[PDB]
Each structure stands twice: as structure tokens, then as C-alpha cells.
């Protein structure tokens, strides 16, 4: 197969990066960075969600794979002395796939593929914006601004927002508030949201129209915005399997000890 | 078809009861509380719960209908006015499903139906369970109790203990903590944690063995009991729909205004 | 000075009190657990909250010492080893005193003084109370039930609750619900409440009469119950200081690290 | 007295504005908005903080009021229809006043007043800063970012951030956190922390040294910030009262209806 390695960048990713090209030269396997079947992040969640990002185009043809160089990830899941093991097996095993989020930002329109999970903030100002789920005006929220989640995105920055995680199995997606005010004049939901495929969650901008949007590590300013559409992807990503690390083991090592 | 209707027990109710028995007898519609086909439920969600939990074990041969005397429901969502409009049309309709919660109590053993959800709390004591998913121990809860919820459940219980409100379409269940003691010495995940199907989380007492249960409106307490096993069920509840009444616009209705 | 002791009942915790009493005997100290001028509590916090109500109506004429014979508590901060040295200070040092929290229960009339809080739930049963803020009616609570924190009592049950730190040098009380139910029907505050002296917050029963009411580790049902008046008691506990052992300080080591 | 009158701006409140200036011609009420006796918010929460920001130099020498146009305010807590009967009084009254919070930011150094809060947030990118409280390091913050708010500035922000409402006759000042990242690696208290007079809280940072930081409405952007100080003012604001609107009152108004 072909195959491709990115690195966190510093001495010990590097080098490890090096023994696993090393190795594989050992097998049948062409290096190519342009369309590979095989991509293997070396560092943290963060060094694989860049490596994701780098691909996104071709992602129902690559299988990737997380090396942890530092402290245990949710996608860099693998340990350094686990690698030789790793290309050894990776010269023939089972794929597993995790929800996407797409987002929509209409003015033309741009869409994105969010990992983790797509976030909308205010340039400088107050945040204001109409909450639409399937067309029907839901909530009008004022705070410091929304996200919404992926499956496995939900251990991330929607934890820390109060959100609940969920199995990457569920197809699915969560909203969850940043800083919402609620007195008589305002009110929101104020529970985190899950929407099923094919629920469209909108944002309307209700005077300003200039947000921060974010999807995954990517953050930028959008201009003249009318819209910001949400909606579990079509697409999937597919990662490689070598033997099991259950997603709630995952979560005990990270969290509970 | 066979029918029954049940009521909250008030004026309005029983009235709104005989009305449409009275109705229903201008039609082919025999009355048979033991094994109708319709169930349908006058007064509140807490009506509907006991409506449900008096024919629990005709599950699948049942679809239920829910009509709300008082303020909007989840279950009981249907206007008393659109009672006469909901007679003609049951004379024939379409059918909504929700997922359950099975609820397993071992010493024997005893398995529960839930609607809304179950809890576990302690009887009169520190309350302290290991809890286990898929057999991997996750964590040793200490604080008041636990809540597993049905997604329909969500908007209940559930929401008061910060779980998120999940769509009725997703086949899953939502675990929530009761003021979960968090210290250097104790440790919990404190988000909630939505299961997918085939999840199976098993409650563990770890020095008290006598637990307060509850399923949905009853409450009994426990003794001996070695196991508290939850798991999405396998039978579904069926509601007979009539119009589109989308569960998030239910939950605005509720909830925002 | 007459003195006393009391032991959480383990090993370690009766041969640490009788060196300690042995080496009281070195000097002119007399144990008294009748009219002590110091109460030495060994254990953990929860065998101090004992000491403190086993000589409540004694308050100002006592000077409280704890013991960690387990893990640090907030009382309970003085490691073992430091007892030989504790002994030698105490046989002639400053004091430092926190608020209490007054409660009164009217039917006659019972008042109690809590060192961390006091906690009012339902018998069995839906929990619904009004909430009078120095004879204003502030809210109609429905939920599991309600907890009136002392300063030094935050970092207990209150924290779990999702209430706020607070130095025991300020002289209030915290009010933090537990899992109130908030829909267009029913509306409560929400956020906790800090209370100065002199406020009296008062819970007043809206059908059901009868509470699960908790002082410290005291439960006990009471019926009939009209009235639940909580206030900052005038008395203050007194505690022997022999070096800095800061508040925040205590906080970083038992939740940080 | 000397006297000075702002304005939201709006039509309903210029035209108060000059019907209060022209019922004041009517007494021995000289006008000067350079050094009044006396600053009359007329608009909003928010118009009243600006009034209090462009007289924050002359503090014990004014008395403030706050007179609402729009819904009720906690500082503009006056109705319209009240202001002519607000002339005639004030033509001669008791004085409340609430504390204040002093922020201070070190390279030179910057100090500031704030009458709500201040927050910290980044400079596009990760938010890392140490919290030492009076000298001993408490905690290292990973999040969006922290709030430090005053007693009377608790039913703002802070009241999002899920900190709790606390009376303005409480010295006090309190710290909430903004989405703390919290795993086995990262651990911060995540209650808020009420702190007294006198008690410094120092925000450190790790890495990066620019820092988005507000005081009420103004936010600015910091560069080479070496340290920010909190702690409770030992200045003032000081309103004119004229009769009886309790804080919980005023509260109860603002939240529950
Ligand atoms: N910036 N920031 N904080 C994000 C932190 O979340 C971690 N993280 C990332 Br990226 N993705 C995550 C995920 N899906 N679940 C849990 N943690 C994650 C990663 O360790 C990073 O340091
Ligand atoms: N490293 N990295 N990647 C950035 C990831 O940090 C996560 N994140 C962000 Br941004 N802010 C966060 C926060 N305040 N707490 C936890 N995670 C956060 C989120 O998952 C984002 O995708
Ligand atoms: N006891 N209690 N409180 C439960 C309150 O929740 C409401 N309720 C019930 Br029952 N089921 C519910 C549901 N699935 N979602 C939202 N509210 C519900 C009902 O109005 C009842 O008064
Ligand atoms: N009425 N009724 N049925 C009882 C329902 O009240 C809900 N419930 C209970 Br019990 N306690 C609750 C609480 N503290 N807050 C909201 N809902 C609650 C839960 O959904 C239960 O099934
Ligand atoms: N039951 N229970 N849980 C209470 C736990 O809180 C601890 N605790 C007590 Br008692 N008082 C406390 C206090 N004021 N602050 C923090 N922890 C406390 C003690 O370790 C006990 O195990
Ligand atoms: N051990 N002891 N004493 C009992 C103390 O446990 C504390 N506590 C109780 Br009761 N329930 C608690 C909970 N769910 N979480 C934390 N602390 C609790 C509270 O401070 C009480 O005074
Ligand atoms: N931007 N923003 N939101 C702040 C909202 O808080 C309100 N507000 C302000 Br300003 N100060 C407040 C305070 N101390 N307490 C409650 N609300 C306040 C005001 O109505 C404003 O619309
Ligand atoms: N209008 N006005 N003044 C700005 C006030 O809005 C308040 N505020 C800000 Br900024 N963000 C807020 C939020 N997300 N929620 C509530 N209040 C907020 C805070 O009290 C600030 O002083």
C-alpha cells in the first residue's frame, strides 16, 4: 500500500517517524504523501487532527493511525514501542469509522469537515444569533457563542462546555451553549442538544453579521455571514484497527486515571 | 379496533373520557381495557407513564395516544379540542416508535420496563457503587445516585441533573450523576455519557448492598441486591401520530415558551 | 487546661490518642470530657463534625484541634507526627473561628447549629417548597431539595452541589439547589445564593408537610413541619491555630493535587 | 447640589432626560456634569456603567442613580413615571454603596475600577495562564478564559459562568472559570472561589504573554502582560436610595418574573 507518516516535529516523533519508514522499507510499502492508503499521525490528537485536515479530500480511501508520543489521545492512541509491531501488521485488518460534522457558511458558500466540532463566535462584540432546527426557529441565543460536536469530538472542547460524551457509534451531533444569559427578557434551552442524521441546525445572525467561526483547529473571521448550517456529514472517517481499545477504556485512562 | 382510555381522575378528565367513549361508539370501536389496541391516556406525562406501565407487557400490540388536560406534555400532547378530530381518525394513521430502557436487578433477578429512566440512591447512607460498561470497571461513583434516561426521557429527570436532551430517533441511553463528591481521593467522569445499543452498564455495590430504586413513577427499595444492569431494551413503545408535532418543537413549547 | 479526645474508633487513631494522653500527662493538663477547654478530634472530618456536636453548648468555651489520621480534611489538618509537637504548644497559642449555620424548625420549636450545612428533601415523595427571603417570596422550588452551606462547609456537600468556595472569614451562608425542575411552569433562580448575616432565608411547605431535614451528619424525619428558617447563627466555632496552614492552601491540597 | 443627567441615547430617554434637567430648574439645582453631586443613569445596566466609568475619579464625591427606560435593570432599578417624584427628593436621602473590584495589570503598571467584572481571555490561541492566590500557587488554568466579578456584578456574567448571585453588602469578589479543559493532565478547583478583602489573586502567564482583558464594557488588548492583580477595591460606588428595592427583590424581579 501506499503510505505516509506526519510528525509532531520534535526529536522523538521524528525519529520515530524515520524506524517506521525504516521498517516499512523492509516491506512492500511506497511512501507517497499525495495519495496514500495509510496515514500514521505521530504526536497528539492535535498532530492528528492536521494530518486529517491534510486528507480530507480522500477520506474513504485512507485508514489513519494515531501514535501518541507524549501522553495517551483519543485519536493518537497507540504507544511508540507498539510501532515496530504496528508495521509489521499494517503490511497486510479491520476499519473502524467515526461520524463527521459538515458546516455550512452561506454569504457564495463555503463547507467544511469538522473532527472534533465547528464553534461560532462574536468579533469583538455581543452574540446574537437564531437558533433554526429543521426550519422551525427554535431559541434566539445571547452569550459568548455555540458549539457543536462530533461523537468522538465530545471528549474535547464540548466536555469542558458541559456537554455529554457519546459513543462514536451514534451517529449523531451536539449543541452545546457557551456563556448563555437567562433572565425574563432572554431564554434558552440551556441543556446541551442531540440531533440525529439529517437534522439541519441553523444559526442566523440577528443584527451583526461578522463571526468567528471554527472548525477543529482552523479559526477564522467571516464577513457578511447569513447563515451557518450544521448537519452530521455524509462522509466518515476510517481508522485502522489492530486490537481493541474500547472508546470508554479510552475515556477512564483519560479522565479517571 | 379495541380501545381504552384512562384519565387523571379530575373533572375535565373523566368528562373529556366519557365524550369520547361516546364518540368512539358512533363507530366500529369496541371498549377493552384487557387487550385493546389503543391506548389512550387523559391528563399529564404522568398519566401517560402509568398508562404505559399498565400494559407493558402488550407493548408491541399497542399503540398509545396522549391527551393533555393541563399544560402540554412530551407524551400527553395532544389538545383536548382536537379530541372529537382524533376520534374519527382513530376509526381507520401512522406509527412513531421511542426506544426503552431495561433495567436489570439481580440478588433472583427482576427486569424493569422504563419510559423516562431509572435511578439508583441510597438508603439512608453514603451511597458508593463501582460502575462498569461492557465489563471494563470506569469509575467508583460516591455521591447521591445515578440516572440512566430514554432519550424521550431526556426532558425530564434527566434534564435536572444537566444530561443533555437527545432526539427520540437515537437508540441509546444517558447516565447522569447525582452530586458526585470529586476530591484527590474520589473520581467520576461528571459528564454524562450517552450508550449506544448491545451497551451494557452494570451498577456494583461496593460495601451497602441495599439501594433505593426507581422505574419511571415507582420508587421501592432493594435489599441484597448484587447487580443493577442497564441497557437499551429491545421493545419499543409505539404512539399512533395523527400530525407532524416535531420533538423539538415540543421541546420549545415546553421549555422556551 | 481540662482537655478530651475522641478517636474515629480504628487502631491508628486509638494508640495516636493514647500517646497523645500520655504525653498530656506530662504536663498540668487534666482530661475532663465533661467541661474540656480543648477538644482533640482524631480521624477525619467527619469524626470532627462528631467532636464539634457532641460540645455544641459549650462553643466558647472550647478551642477545637483535628487530627488527619487518613487523608487531610479541612478540620481534621494536622498530620500525626505533629501530635507529640501539637502537645508540647498546647500545654499553654492564637484562635481562629468560623461562622455557624442556624437552622429552626417550627411545628413547638427545634433549633440546631450546623458546621458544614443543612440539607431539606422529601419524605417519598415530590419535594415542592416557597423560598422567603426576609419575608419576600422569592421562588417556588421543585426538585430533590435544597442546602444552606456554612463558609467552611462549601468545600463539602455544597461543592458537589455546584456551589461556590468561600473563605471562612466571610460571614455567610450559600443556598444551592439540587436538581430543580425548570420549565414555563416552574422557575427557580438557578444559580446559588450567598447570604450575609442577619438574612433569613425560610422554606415554607406547599402541600406536603413532611422533609428529610439534615444537619451535618444527623438526618431525621420531621412531621408537620410549617416552617424551615435558616440564618448565620451568632455563635462561631473556635480553633486552635499553631502555624499557617492557609484556606486555600487546604483547598489546592485536597482538590488539586 | 450640583447634578448631572446621561442618556441611552433613544428618544424616551433624551426626553426624560430634559423634563428631569427642566424639573430641576425648578429648584436650587445647579447643572454641571464636571464636578456633580449627583449622576443620573438614564437607559440601561449598561448606560448606568458607563455613567459610573466617566465619573470613577470622583467616586465618594458622587451619589448615583439609575433610572430604567427600558426593562428593569439592577442599577437602573428606578421606572420613568418616578423621576418626577426622584426630583423633588433628591432636591434635598440616604446613601447605599456597593464594593468594587481592583484590577491590576503589570509589564509599567495599569490599574482599574470595575463596577462588574474583569475577565482574562487569548489572543487567538490556547489560554494558559497560573492562578496564585496571596503568594501560593493554587492551580495552572487551561480554558477559554477567567472572571473575576463583584458582588453587585454577580447577576451578570459571572451569573453564566455559573457562579453564585451574592449580596452587594458582602466585601467580596468572585473568580469563575470559562470552559476549563480538565483530564488526568490539566486539573483546576472548577467551583467558583469567593475571596475577602484583602486577598490577592494573580493571574501568571505560562507562555504566551497577550492577553484579551475587559473591565466591564472596555476591552482591550494587552501585550508583554507580566501579571494581572485582583482583589476587592478599597474604593466605593455609593447610590442614593429613596426607598425600599431589596437586592433579592430585585432579583426575584429580574429572573423569576
Ligand atoms: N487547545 N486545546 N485543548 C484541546 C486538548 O484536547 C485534546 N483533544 C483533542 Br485535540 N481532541 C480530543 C478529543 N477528541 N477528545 C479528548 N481530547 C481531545 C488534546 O490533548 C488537546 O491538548
Ligand atoms: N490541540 N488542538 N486542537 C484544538 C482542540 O482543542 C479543543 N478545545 C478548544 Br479550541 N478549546 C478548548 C477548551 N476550552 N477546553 C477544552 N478543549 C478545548 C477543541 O477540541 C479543538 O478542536
Ligand atoms: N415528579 N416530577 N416531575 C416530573 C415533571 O416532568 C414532566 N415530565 C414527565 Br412525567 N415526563 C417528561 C418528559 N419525558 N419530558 C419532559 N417532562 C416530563 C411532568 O410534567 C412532571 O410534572
Ligand atoms: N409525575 N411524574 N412522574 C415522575 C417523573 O418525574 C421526573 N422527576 C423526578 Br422522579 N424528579 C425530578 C426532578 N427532580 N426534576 C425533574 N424531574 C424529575 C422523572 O421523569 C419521573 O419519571
Ligand atoms: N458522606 N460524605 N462525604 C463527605 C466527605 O466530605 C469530606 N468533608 C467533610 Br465531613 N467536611 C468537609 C468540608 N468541610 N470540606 C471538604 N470536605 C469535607 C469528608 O472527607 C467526607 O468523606
Ligand atoms: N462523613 N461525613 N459527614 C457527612 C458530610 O458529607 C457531605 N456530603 C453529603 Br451528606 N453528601 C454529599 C455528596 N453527595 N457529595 C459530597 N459531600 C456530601 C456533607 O458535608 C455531610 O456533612
Ligand atoms: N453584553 N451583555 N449582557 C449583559 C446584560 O446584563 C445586564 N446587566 C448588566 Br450591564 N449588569 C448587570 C448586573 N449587574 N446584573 C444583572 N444584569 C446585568 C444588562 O441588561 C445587559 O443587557
Ligand atoms: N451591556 N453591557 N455591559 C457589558 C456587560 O455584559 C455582561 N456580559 C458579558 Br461582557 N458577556 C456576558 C454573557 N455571555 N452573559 C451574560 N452577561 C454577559 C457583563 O456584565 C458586562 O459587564
Known amino acids: ?23 516499512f522499507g523492509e516491506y512492500d510499502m511506497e511512501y507517497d504523501d499525495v495519495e496514500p492508503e495509510i496515514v500514521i ?19 474513504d480511501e ?84 455555540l458549539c457543536m460536536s462530533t461523537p468522538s469530538g465530545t471528549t474535547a472542547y464540548n466536555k469542558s462546555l458541559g456537554g455529554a460524551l457519546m459513543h462514536p457509534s451514534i451517529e449523531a451531533m451536539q449543541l452545546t451553549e457557551m456563556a448563555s444569559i437567562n433572565n425574563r427578557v432572554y431564554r434558552t434551552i440551556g441543556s446541551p442538544l442531540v440531533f440525529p442524521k439529517h437534522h439541519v441546525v441553523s444559526l442566523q445572525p440577528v443584527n451583526d453579521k461578522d463571526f468567528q467561526i471554527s472548525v477543529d483547529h482552523l479559526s477564522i473571521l467571516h464577513r457578511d455571514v447569513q447563515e451557518i448550517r450544521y448537519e452530521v456529514s455524509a462522509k466518515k472517517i476510517h481508522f485502522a484497527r489492530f486490537r481493541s481499545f474500547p472508546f470508554w477504556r479510552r475515556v477512564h485512562d483519560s479522565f479517571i486515571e
Open 1 to 23: 500500500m501506499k503510505y505516509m507518516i506526519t510528525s509532531k516535529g520534535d526529536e522523538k516523533s521524528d525519529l520515530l517517524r524515520l524506524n517506521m519508514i525504516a521498517g
Open 41 to 59: 499521525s505521530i504526536g497528539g490528537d492535535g498532530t492528528f487532527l492536521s494530518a486529517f485536515h491534510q486528507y480530507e479530500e480522500r477520506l
Open 62 to 145: 485512507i485508514a489513519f493511525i494515531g501514535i501518541h508520543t507524549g501522553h495517551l489521545g483519543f485519536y493518537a492512541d497507540w504507544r511508540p514501542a507498539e510501532a515496530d509491531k504496528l508495521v509489521k501488521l499494517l503490511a497486510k485488518y479491520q476499519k473502524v469509522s467515526y461520524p463527521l460534522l459538515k458546516t455550512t457558511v452561506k454569504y457564495k458558500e463555503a463547507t467544511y469537515l469538522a473532527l472534533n466540532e465547528s464553534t461560532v463566535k462574536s468579533s469583538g462584540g455581543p452574540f446574537v444569533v437564531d437558533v433554526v432546527i429543521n426550519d422551525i426557529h427554535f431559541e434566539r441565543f445571547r452569550g459568548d457563542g
